[PDB]
Design an enzyme around this catalytic site. Structure first.
Site, short mmCIF file in Angstrom:
data_model
loop_
_atom_site.label_atom_id
_atom_site.label_comp_id
_atom_site.label_asym_id
_atom_site.label_seq_id
_atom_site.Cartn_x
_atom_site.Cartn_y
_atom_site.Cartn_z
N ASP A 147 0.82 -1.21 0.00
CA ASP A 147 0.00 0.00 0.00
C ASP A 147 0.85 1.26 0.00
O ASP A 147 0.57 2.24 0.70
CB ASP A 147 -1.00 -0.02 1.17
CG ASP A 147 -2.11 1.03 1.02
OD1 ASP A 147 -2.34 1.51 -0.12
OD2 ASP A 147 -2.73 1.37 2.04
N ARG A 151 0.18 9.29 0.59
CA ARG A 151 -0.62 9.44 1.80
C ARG A 151 -0.06 8.59 2.95
O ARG A 151 -0.33 8.87 4.12
CB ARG A 151 -2.09 9.09 1.51
CG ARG A 151 -2.30 7.68 0.95
CD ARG A 151 -3.78 7.26 0.76
NE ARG A 151 -3.82 5.87 0.30
CZ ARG A 151 -3.78 5.47 -0.98
NH1 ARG A 151 -3.77 6.35 -1.96
NH2 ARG A 151 -3.78 4.17 -1.27
N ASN A 152 0.71 7.56 2.61
CA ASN A 152 1.23 6.60 3.56
C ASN A 152 2.73 6.77 3.83
O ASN A 152 3.36 5.89 4.39
CB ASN A 152 0.94 5.17 3.07
CG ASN A 152 -0.56 4.88 2.96
OD1 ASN A 152 -1.36 5.40 3.72
ND2 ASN A 152 -0.93 4.03 2.00
N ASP A 165 2.47 3.14 7.36
CA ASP A 165 1.26 2.40 6.99
C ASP A 165 1.59 0.95 6.66
O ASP A 165 1.19 0.44 5.61
CB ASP A 165 0.55 3.05 5.79
CG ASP A 165 -0.80 2.42 5.50
OD1 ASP A 165 -1.40 1.87 6.43
OD2 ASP A 165 -1.26 2.46 4.34
N1 LIG Z 1 -1.69 13.01 12.29
C1 LIG Z 1 -0.51 13.47 12.72
O1 LIG Z 1 -0.34 14.61 12.99
C2 LIG Z 1 0.49 12.43 12.79
C3 LIG Z 1 1.78 12.64 13.21
N2 LIG Z 1 2.67 11.61 13.27
C4 LIG Z 1 2.30 10.38 12.92
C5 LIG Z 1 3.00 9.25 12.89
C6 LIG Z 1 2.08 8.35 12.46
N3 LIG Z 1 0.90 8.88 12.21
S1 LIG Z 1 -0.41 8.05 11.65
O2 LIG Z 1 -0.55 6.89 12.11
O3 LIG Z 1 -1.52 8.68 11.94
C7 LIG Z 1 -0.40 7.87 9.90
C8 LIG Z 1 -1.16 8.79 9.22
C9 LIG Z 1 -1.22 8.79 7.85
C10 LIG Z 1 -0.54 7.86 7.12
C11 LIG Z 1 0.14 6.87 7.73
C12 LIG Z 1 0.30 6.89 9.11
N4 LIG Z 1 1.20 5.84 9.59
O4 LIG Z 1 2.01 6.07 10.50
O5 LIG Z 1 1.23 4.73 9.17
C13 LIG Z 1 1.03 10.13 12.50
C14 LIG Z 1 0.12 11.17 12.43
#
Ligand SMILES: NC(=O)c1cnc2ccn(S(=O)(=O)c3ccccc3[N+](=O)[O-])c2c1
Length: 289
Positions: A147, A151-152, A165
């Site tokens: 994936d 976005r990921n 992700d």
């Molecule tokens: N939403 C935020 O501000 C934020 C900040 N840091 C992180 C680190 C991981 N995420 S997450 O899980 O929400 C996310 C959000 C969007 C895409 C993927 C991912 N991921 O870590 O796999 C984050 C989100």
């Protein structure tokens, strides 16, 4: 809960963050996926310093076997470690919580779509280079992402791109781009999928390479949606007719050749991420900024 195998519990010990060390600010959501909402949190480490984290609450666990699979992967994903891959800080059990490093600039797609920023063509190609470096790592560990998309991938305070992700963090953070298969019920980001994956539902590192080519096109368009005028399920036919994404206005020709290579209908004739790191480093090097 109590039904968990104690040996598994013992094996994951080193991943598990205790409540005393984790402060989660549950009143504000910073991100939302399918399997959970995401909150800011601070992790007290060895020294007593605040590590800023993004904490995800896994909302759809219904039975104890799902939890065991969740710990089992926690143990695997905790060993993964590369500058261009998002690390797992750990898990809180005592909703289960996934603790990730906080990424100041969010996901790569929203970053490049944000009109207050002007990442140059060089910067954009740099982001792609960094993605390929993390994918090179993952592929070396013979892990298939399935994936990969802008976005990921996340961006930290130093503009390091982290492939995210996957593992415990795997979600649909934008459900618009996922479809359901008529005969298997899997959730498919169809416009990023390789031809074979759409036909036979098979995923490999070479199908990660296909998606990487779509990700480069995303970079060069600063986050425009791919195939805007091709409906979700007309995409297999579109591709089978020998058609591909058009070259973006500000995509340099040699990078478009890279993309097109990534979408070769023969998985085996697509470049490897190691060859993509080499060639894209070269392309990146020829720009000023
Ligand atoms: N939403 C935020 O501000 C934020 C900040 N840091 C992180 C680190 C991981 N995420 S997450 O899980 O929400 C996310 C959000 C969007 C895409 C993927 C991912 N991921 O870590 O796999 C984050 C989100």
């Amino acid at each position: 809960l109590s039904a968990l195998n104690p040996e598994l519990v013992q094996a994951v010990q080193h991943v598990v963050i205790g409540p005393s060390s984790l402060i989660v600010h549950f009143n504000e959501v910073i991100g939302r996926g399918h399997f959970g909402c995401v909150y800011h949190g601070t992790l007290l480490d060895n020294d007593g310093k605040k590590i800023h984290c993004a904490v995800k609450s896994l909302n759809r666990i219904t039975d104890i076997g799902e939890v065991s699979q969740f710990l089992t992967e926690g143990i695997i994903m905790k060993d993964f470690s590369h500058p261009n891959v998002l690390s797992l800080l750990g898990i809180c059990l005592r909703s289960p919580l996934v603790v990730l490093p906080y990424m100041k600039h969010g996901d790569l797609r929203n970053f490049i779509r944000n009109e207050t920023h002007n990442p140059t063509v060089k910067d954009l190609i740099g982001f792609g280079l960094q993605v390929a470096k993390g994918m090179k790592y993952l592929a070396s560990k013979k892990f298939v992402h399935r994936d990969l998309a802008a976005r990921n991938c996340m961006l930290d305070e130093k503009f390091t791109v982290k492939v995210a992700d996957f593992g415990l963090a795997r979600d649909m953070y934008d459900k618009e781009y996922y479809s359901v298969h008529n005969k298997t019920g899997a959730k498919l980001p169809v416009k990023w999928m390789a031809l074979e994956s759409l036909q036979t539902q098979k995923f490999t590192t070479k199908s990660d390479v296909w998606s990487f080519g779509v990700l480069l096109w995303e970079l060069m368009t600063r986050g425009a949606p791919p195939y805007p005028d091709v409906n979700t399920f007309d995409i297999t036919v579109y591709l089978l007719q020998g058609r591909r994404l058009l070259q973006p206005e500000y995509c340099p020709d040699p990078l478009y050749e890279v993309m097109l290579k990534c979408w070769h209908p023969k998985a085996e004739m697509r470049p490897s991420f190691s060859e993509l790191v080499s060639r894209i480093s070269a392309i990146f090097s020829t720009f000023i900024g």
